[PDB]
Design a protein around this motif. Structure first.
Motif, short mmCIF file in Angstrom:
data_model
loop_
_atom_site.label_atom_id
_atom_site.label_comp_id
_atom_site.label_asym_id
_atom_site.label_seq_id
_atom_site.Cartn_x
_atom_site.Cartn_y
_atom_site.Cartn_z
N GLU A 62 0.78 -1.23 0.00
CA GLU A 62 0.00 0.00 0.00
C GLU A 62 0.82 1.28 0.00
O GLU A 62 2.01 1.29 0.33
CB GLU A 62 -0.91 0.01 1.22
CG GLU A 62 -0.16 -0.21 2.52
CD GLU A 62 -0.95 0.25 3.73
OE1 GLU A 62 -1.87 1.08 3.57
OE2 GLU A 62 -0.62 -0.21 4.85
N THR A 63 0.15 2.39 -0.32
CA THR A 63 0.77 3.70 -0.34
C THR A 63 -0.01 4.65 0.57
O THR A 63 -1.23 4.61 0.62
CB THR A 63 0.88 4.26 -1.76
OG1 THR A 63 1.80 3.45 -2.52
CG2 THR A 63 1.38 5.69 -1.74
N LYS A 64 0.71 5.50 1.29
CA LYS A 64 0.08 6.44 2.20
C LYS A 64 0.51 7.86 1.91
O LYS A 64 1.70 8.12 1.68
CB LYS A 64 0.43 6.09 3.65
CG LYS A 64 0.13 4.65 4.05
CD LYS A 64 0.66 4.37 5.45
CE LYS A 64 0.27 2.98 5.93
NZ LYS A 64 0.94 2.63 7.22
N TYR A 65 -0.43 8.79 1.92
CA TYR A 65 -0.10 10.19 1.69
C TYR A 65 -0.69 11.09 2.76
O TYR A 65 -1.86 10.98 3.11
CB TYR A 65 -0.54 10.66 0.31
CG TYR A 65 -0.21 12.12 0.05
CD1 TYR A 65 1.06 12.62 0.32
CD2 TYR A 65 -1.18 13.00 -0.42
CE1 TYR A 65 1.36 13.96 0.11
CE2 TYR A 65 -0.88 14.34 -0.64
CZ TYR A 65 0.39 14.81 -0.37
OH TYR A 65 0.70 16.14 -0.58
N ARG A 66 0.14 12.00 3.25
CA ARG A 66 -0.27 12.95 4.27
C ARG A 66 -0.20 14.34 3.67
O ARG A 66 0.86 14.78 3.21
CB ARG A 66 0.66 12.86 5.48
CG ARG A 66 0.02 13.34 6.75
CD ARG A 66 0.95 14.23 7.53
NE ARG A 66 0.19 15.17 8.34
CZ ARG A 66 -0.49 16.19 7.83
NH1 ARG A 66 -0.50 16.41 6.52
NH2 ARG A 66 -1.18 16.99 8.64
N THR A 73 -5.55 13.64 4.46
CA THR A 73 -4.64 12.50 4.36
C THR A 73 -5.25 11.40 3.50
O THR A 73 -6.31 10.87 3.83
CB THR A 73 -4.23 11.98 5.74
OG1 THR A 73 -5.14 12.49 6.73
CG2 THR A 73 -2.81 12.41 6.08
N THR A 75 -5.05 7.65 1.78
CA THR A 75 -4.44 6.33 1.89
C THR A 75 -4.83 5.46 0.71
O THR A 75 -5.94 4.92 0.66
CB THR A 75 -4.81 5.65 3.22
OG1 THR A 75 -4.36 6.46 4.31
CG2 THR A 75 -4.16 4.28 3.30
N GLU A 76 -3.92 5.32 -0.25
CA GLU A 76 -4.18 4.50 -1.43
C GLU A 76 -3.65 3.09 -1.23
O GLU A 76 -2.55 2.76 -1.67
CB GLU A 76 -3.58 5.15 -2.67
CG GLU A 76 -4.41 6.29 -3.24
CD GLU A 76 -4.73 7.38 -2.22
OE1 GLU A 76 -4.08 7.41 -1.15
OE2 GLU A 76 -5.62 8.21 -2.50
N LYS A 77 -4.45 2.27 -0.55
CA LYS A 77 -4.07 0.89 -0.26
C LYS A 77 -4.40 -0.02 -1.44
O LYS A 77 -5.41 -0.72 -1.43
CB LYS A 77 -4.75 0.41 1.02
CG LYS A 77 -4.50 1.32 2.23
CD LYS A 77 -5.17 0.79 3.51
CE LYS A 77 -4.84 1.68 4.71
NZ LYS A 77 -5.34 1.12 5.99
N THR A 86 -9.41 3.58 -1.61
CA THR A 86 -8.66 4.71 -1.10
C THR A 86 -9.33 5.34 0.12
O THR A 86 -10.43 4.95 0.50
CB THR A 86 -8.37 5.75 -2.19
OG1 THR A 86 -9.60 6.26 -2.71
CG2 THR A 86 -7.57 5.12 -3.32
N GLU A 87 -8.66 6.32 0.71
CA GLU A 87 -9.18 7.01 1.89
C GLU A 87 -8.92 8.51 1.84
O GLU A 87 -7.81 8.95 1.54
CB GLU A 87 -8.56 6.45 3.17
CG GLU A 87 -9.09 5.10 3.61
CD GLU A 87 -8.69 4.76 5.05
OE1 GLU A 87 -8.61 5.69 5.88
OE2 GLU A 87 -8.47 3.57 5.35
#
Length: 288
Positions: A62-66, A73, A75-77, A86-87
């Motif tokens: 997964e990839t996380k972005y803040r 924020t 969250t591209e899991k 995504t989130e």
């Protein structure tokens, strides 16, 4: 000490469970989880699981972005097979307030594509979620009426499904929060009795006990857990169940960003009931 005056619904349910999960990475399965990150503000997370010991090979990265301290924020899991979503996290400000979230959760192929909007508003002695699952065909509506009180607490959960049917399965639980202790009782819907109790008398010494009674006249299953936050980067577990489960968790830390956790379960010497299988956990980290 003290703490705060919030805590949602998954409270004692997860603080003791994470405390119950400490029993290494699964009872019997290898999961080499590698965490990374970038100073550009981009957080990363690669993972490789091998569940059921060898009864299944899976890879999940997964990839996380803040974004901005006040911003949001994402969250591209993603995944590898598999599925994705995504989130989008919504915050009003550091002062808690209300925090909305968006789920782009979907179904890749041969699946039921369904995202949802997880809401949530908190404050002093209270906090209720507006978790909405707008899934395929009939959308689902979640809720939660957690209530705060001076060292006292009472929760209430309602789960709505389908447009035609109003109620599905809603549970209600009670218990109060305490300076480093947590005591509650879960009352699952469908007629179920159960509760749990955390006791932290030491930072090096930790304990907890679970148990639930199933209505009707049914027997009873126990649960005795405990972890000694050993000074050195290596804590263990007292995963002993009175129901019929006799296993132990052994957590180990190996400095910097790499950690190895190993645990196992022993249920006597059953042939058609169960045996002895072990679990493995690896952790490769970084800086970048």
């Amino acid at each position: 000490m003290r703490g705060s005056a919030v805590p949602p619904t998954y409270a004692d349910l997860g603080k003791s469970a994470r405390d119950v999960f400490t029993k290494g990475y699964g009872f019997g399965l290898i999961k080499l989880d590698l965490k990374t990150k970038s100073e550009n503000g981009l957080e990363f997370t690669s993972s490789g699981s091998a569940n059921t010991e060898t009864t299944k090979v899976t890879g999940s990265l997964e990839t996380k972005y803040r974004w901005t301290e006040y911003g949001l924020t994402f969250t591209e899991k993603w995944n590898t097979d598999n599925t994705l979503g995504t989130e989008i996290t919504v915050e009003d400000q550091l002062a808690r307030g209300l925090k909305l979230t968006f789920d782009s959760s979907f179904s890749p192929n041969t699946g039921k594509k369904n995202a949802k909007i997880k809401t949530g508003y908190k404050r002093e002695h209270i906090n209720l979620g507006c978790d909405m699952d707008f899934d395929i065909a009939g959308p689902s509506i979640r809720g939660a009426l957690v209530l705060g009180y001076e060292g006292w607490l009472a929760g209430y959960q309602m789960n709505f499904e389908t447009a035609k049917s109003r109620v599905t399965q809603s549970n209600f639980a009670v218990g109060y929060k305490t300076d480093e202790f947590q005591l509650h009782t879960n009352v699952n819907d469908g007629t179920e009795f159960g509760g749990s109790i955390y006791q932290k008398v030491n930072k090096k010494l930790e304990t907890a006990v679970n148990l639930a009674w199933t209505a009707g006249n049914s027997n009873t299953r126990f649960g005795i857990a405990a972890k000694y936050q050993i000074d050195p980067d290596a804590c263990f577990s007292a995963k002993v169940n009175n129901s019929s489960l006799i296993g132990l968790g052994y957590t180990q830390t190996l400095k910097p960003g790499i950690k190895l956790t190993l645990s196992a379960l022993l249920d006597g010497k059953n042939v058609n009931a169960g045996g002895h299988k072990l679990g493995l956990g690896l952790e490769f980290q970084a800086r970048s």
